[PDB]
């Protein structure tokens, strides 16, 4: 009822030029999140056991 649906149309945007700046920070931040998941994993397994 809001609108006749033709809303989403294909479009093109280029990929941002890569550098050391964000991938190494992202992958070590993901290491950090997965070390937290390992911690929570060990804690939950200990409580369950």
């Amino acid at each position: 009822k809001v609108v006749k649906p033709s809303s989403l149309n294909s479009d093109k945007i280029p990929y941002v030029a890569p550098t050391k700046k964000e991938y190494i920070e992202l992958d070590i931040l993901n290491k950090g999140w997965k070390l937290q998941s390992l911690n929570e994993s060990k804690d939950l397994l200990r409580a369950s056991f």
Binding site: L35, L38, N39, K42, L45, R46, F49
Partner: protein, 115 residues
């Protein structure tokens, strides 16, 4: 009481679930130790090999002995505990409840034993 064979069969089964409980406990300690191993103190590193080896050897032989118990379920059909027919007790309830009654009469019959 139950005949000999069933008693050691239940003892072996009880040993089986106690071994399973020990396996779960050792899983708990190995999960515990891996956490600080990931935290990066290397002092408890040697204990890790021992814990893993004992965990696996506890997991294996328990299942192995439970394999022997199921072979013994199949193999003991009509076997070791051989049949016996010396009056069958569902009938022979009439016979122990004959005997004891007369025993009571004896106690009634002799006044010197009623003390």
């Amino acid at each position: 009481m139950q005949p000999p064979y069933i008693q050691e069969r239940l003892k072996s089964l009880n040993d089986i679930e106690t071994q399973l409980c020990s396996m779960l406990q050792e899983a708990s300690q190995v999960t515990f130790i891996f956490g600080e191993l990931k935290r990066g103190n290397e002092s408890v590193k040697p204990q890790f090999e021992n814990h893993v080896k004992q965990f696996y050897e506890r997991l294996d032989k328990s299942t192995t002995q439970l394999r022997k118990e199921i072979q013994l379920l199949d193999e003991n059909v009509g076997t070791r505990l051989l049949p016996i027919n010396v009056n069958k007790k569902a009938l022979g309830q009439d016979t122990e409840k004959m005997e004891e009654q007369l025993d009571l009469l004896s106690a009634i019959l002799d006044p010197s034993k009623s003390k």
